Amino acid sequence: FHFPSQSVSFKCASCSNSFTIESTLKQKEITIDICGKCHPFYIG
Amino acid sequence: MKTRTEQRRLRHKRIVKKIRATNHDNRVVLMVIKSLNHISVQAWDFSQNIVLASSSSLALKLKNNAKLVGQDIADKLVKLKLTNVVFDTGGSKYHGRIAALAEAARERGLNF
Amino acid sequence: SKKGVGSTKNGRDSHAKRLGAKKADGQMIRTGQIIYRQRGTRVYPGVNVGLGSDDTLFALSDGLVKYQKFGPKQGKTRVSVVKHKL
Amino acid sequence: NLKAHYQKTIAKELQKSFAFSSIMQVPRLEKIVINMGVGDAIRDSKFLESALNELHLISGQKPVATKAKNAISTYKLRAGQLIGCKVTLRGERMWAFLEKLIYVALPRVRDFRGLSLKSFDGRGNYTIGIKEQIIFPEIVYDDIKRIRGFDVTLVTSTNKDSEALALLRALNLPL
Amino acid sequence: MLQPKRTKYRKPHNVSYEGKAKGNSYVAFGEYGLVATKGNWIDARAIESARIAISKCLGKTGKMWIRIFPHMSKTKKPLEVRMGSGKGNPEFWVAVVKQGTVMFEVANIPESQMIKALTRAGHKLPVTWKILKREE
Amino acid sequence: AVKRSTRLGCNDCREINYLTFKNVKKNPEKLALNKFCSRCRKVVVHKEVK
RNA sequence: UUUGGUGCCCAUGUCGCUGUGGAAACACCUGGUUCCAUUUCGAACCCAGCAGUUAAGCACAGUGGAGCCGAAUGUAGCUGCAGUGAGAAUAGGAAAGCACCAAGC
RNA sequence: CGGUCGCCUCCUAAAAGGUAACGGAGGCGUACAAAGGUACCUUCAGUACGGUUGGAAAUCGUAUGUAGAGUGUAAUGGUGU
RNA sequence: UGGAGGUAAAGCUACUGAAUGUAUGAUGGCGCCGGCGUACUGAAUACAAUUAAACUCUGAAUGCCAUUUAUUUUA
């Protein structure tokens, strides 16, 4: 079995994309600048 | 394409045929269908392409845990004296209430 | 005049172990009797047929030999010792 | 969680928008495959640990590599010689990784001007292929020494590519 | 000459073929054919001789095909050598001819010129020439 | 001429018991199988005794 | 018998499409909620249920279409020098059929 | 003497098989403690699509064909859970 | 009568291989400007017919073993 992967939250800087979901076990709250509406053509 | 049912059917048929071939003296055939609601079992005698008895929510012993779903058909088969059956492991692998049902044959006469 | 002549190739007919229809339809066959000899599983044993460690088909029990065509094309041949009383 | 949210409102919206003879011909997803083709691992790139490790990092199932389809001399492998790593994604893990894929990975795609490359096979699949293995924050660019990505694939039981396209359009994926 | 790419076997037996005409009892694309009154083993030298004689005495706008191309091989032994040691030697490839097979099928040139062409090929061919009409 | 079979003996009586084919390439070592022995009438782990 | 189980003959019956019944049962679906399993996990496998369905899984009519089979005579074969009769072609056929159990009966 | 001395794959050798040849087609003097058994699971290769290197093939997800893959061999057939 | 052959034979787009006009004609000769069909290599099929003991989609008679009534002879 894959080594357990736990719940991680998210925080963005230019979009404030907050989403919590089970994922990789090296991170608890991924804070980044580019996520959600940050890419020039992420809109839509 | 596949709907996770015909794989069960194909495994189930291959294994019942192989186990019928293991014993040259063909006995009554226990084919069991692990349905999503309950578990159905039928005594197909592979000498006339017919069924001797059945057990399911409609036949006997309403929906299966309920080990009597196999117990009743085994009792019907020991009224027929076709024990030591060519017992199919089933396309649905031998786990869960089937573990209760399959050995329900052994506890009720089918000495396979 | 002879002082030597051309050689001979390895081209003479290969003889195998004696095979064929050892038993035929209509006669009772007995257990242990060699009913069919094949080199490679091509003619398939049916019921009550034993396959030894030579791809040699003999009678596991007594019966009658039967060669039947079946399948999608009537091309597959099954040899079977059908249960005829000894 | 995207799982229950989608399965309740978005699946029903897709069913009722373009209808069928039932409500189970909805765009269906069997699993999610995550992939790392590393054939130079045999040719001493990092000896197969890179794919296993990083996919395991981005996995939900125990990573199992798959034996090669052929035997080729330009990239040595025969009779097995498992190349790369592969993970299937079922149960919770499907939507668990779809959430990060659609919310985090999508804006970080270098070529993100509308992901409608028609990677459909016309056989009810959608084969997203990216040459940047750094698409999630679940991976650091220190496992492999080559330009690398993933050939992930959305799969459908009843083969219809438009169903996968509808899945794409309704999960904040610009076309 | 006219030569096949390969033969089925390097030294095929000169096996007897008792039966009747298998396959070509007629032409395939021509309008006439040089059909023989016998079936045997013939080589490419007579094939080329008859074919080019036919083409020389025919016209131009007609089309030409050879139907039963040389397909097997010929095994012939030199002479003044005592009998023994098996077969002979592989040599010129052979076109198997049966009772009714056609070698050369030609089309789109005056018909009586076709009859004459097949006759003069029969001069250049070991067999007695036989004329055959258009078939498929 | 040459042999691929092996001569195997029981480890309890030293008699010669078994003669069966034996892979000599990928199993060049002496074979130690638990097969039937007659002077004790039971399955015992035989060994190559020669 | 509507409908669930699938044996059994084959490419006619193999495929494809038009669609139809599902009301109980059935399949998907609800989830990984334990038993159980993944050569990797809820994809099977297990659970314990059906909000839903005739699309698919199941079954049921047609589509002579791809495709199957290919009749008689003759034909080689054969071999008293005719039959013997292929093949192959045509006609035509078939869209499955052969039954039990179980509930809708 | 050339060539030969044990064994097998095809046929001529005339349909059970067989079948002579100084008849033409290939070799072997073995290989697995698993390639045995039991059980459960399990399939085409190829080809195609679209795809991180990955080009035609690797790579994924399929469709695909249903035996031309594979099965120890020389060749034969056989083998579709 | 039963079994199956694979001999003979039609056929080999029903395969193994050579073969031909016709169909896409890629693709390379040949030039052309990633672009283009090719003097030709030209795949395999649609179509066309082929050659063959070691080719058999098919495919006999004969033959073969068994079969039951049967006849010979005291072998």
Query: What are the DSSP calls for E6-44, one per residue?
Result: --S-SS-------S---S-SS-SSSSEEEEESS--EE-H
- Chain C residues whose CB is inside 8 A of the E82 CB are 1-2, 5
Chain D 97..116 CB hits on strand H (< 7 A): none
* DSSP result, C26-86: TSEE-TT-EEEE-SSS-SEE-SSEEE-TTSEEEESS-EEEEEEEETTTT-EEEEEEE----
Number of folded domains that form chain D: 1
Residues 32-91 of B with CB under 7 A from strand G: 33-40, 42, 44, 46, 49-54, 56-60, 63-65, 90-91
Adjacent-strand bridge partners of E35:
E102, E130
What gap in Å lies between CA A14 and CA B21, rounded to an integer? 70
Q: Are E27 and E114 in contact (CB under 8 A)?
A: no
- Indicate the DSSP class of residue D76: B
The CA-atom distances, in angstroms, between C74 and each of B17, C66, E80, E109 are 21, 15, 56, 51
Q: What is the helix, strand, coil percentage profile of chain A, to 5?
A: 0, 25, 75
CA distance C2 to chain E (A): 8
Question: How do strand F16-21 and strand E102-107 relate by DSSP bridges?
Answer: unpaired
> Rounded to whole angstroms, how far apart are CA atoms D154 and D166?
12
Experiment used for this model: cryo-EM
B10: in domain: no
Q: Which amino acid is at A37?
A: K
CA distance D44 to chain A (A): 26
CA–CA dist D13, D24 (Å, integer): 12
Instruction: Kindly provide the resolution of this structure in angstroms, with one decimal.
Output: 15.0
CB distance B19 to B89 below 8 Å: yes
Closest residue, chain B, to D24 (C-alpha): B3
Nearest CB to A34 within list D57, D107, D114: D107
Sign of the torsion angle spanned by Cα atoms E111, E116, E120, E126: positive
| Residues paired with residue D32 on neighbouring β-strands, in sequence order | D89, D154
> Residue B12 falls within a domain, yes or no?
no
- CA angle at residue D33 from D27 to D39, to 5 degrees? 145
Does residue B11 belong to any structural domain of this protein? no
Q: Which chain C residues in 46-75 lie under 8 Å from chain B, judged by CB atoms? A: 47-48, 60-61
Helix (H, G, I), strand (E, B) or coil at D147: coil
Q: What are the counts of helices (DSSP H) followed by strands (DSSP E) for chain E?
A: 2, 7
- CA B5/CA B92 separation, integer angstroms: 9
Chain B residues 73-92 within 7 Å (CB) of strand H? 89-91
Q: Where are the domains of chain F?
A: 1-50
CA angle B88, B91, B94 (to 5 degrees): 70
Q: Is residue B13 in a domain?
A: no
C-alpha angle C74-C78-C81 in degrees, rounded to nearest 5: 140
d(CA B45, CA B47): 5
Which amino acid is it at D95? Answer: W
DSSP structural state of residue F31: P
Residue B46 lies in a domain: yes
Using CA atoms, how far residue D99 sits from A19, D119, F32, in Å, is 8, 21, 58
The answer to whether position B23 is within a domain reads yes
- Which residues neighbour E42 within 8 Å (Cβ) at sequence distance 6 or greater? E94, E95, E97, E125, E126, E127
Backbone angles phi, psi at B32, to 5 degrees: -120, 135
DSSP string, E65-77: EESS---EEEEE-
CB D138: neighbour CB atoms within 10 A?
Answer: 22
Inside any domain, residue B45: yes
Residue pair A39/D109 in contact by the 8 Å Cβ criterion: yes
Alpha helices in D58-160 (DSSP H): 92-100
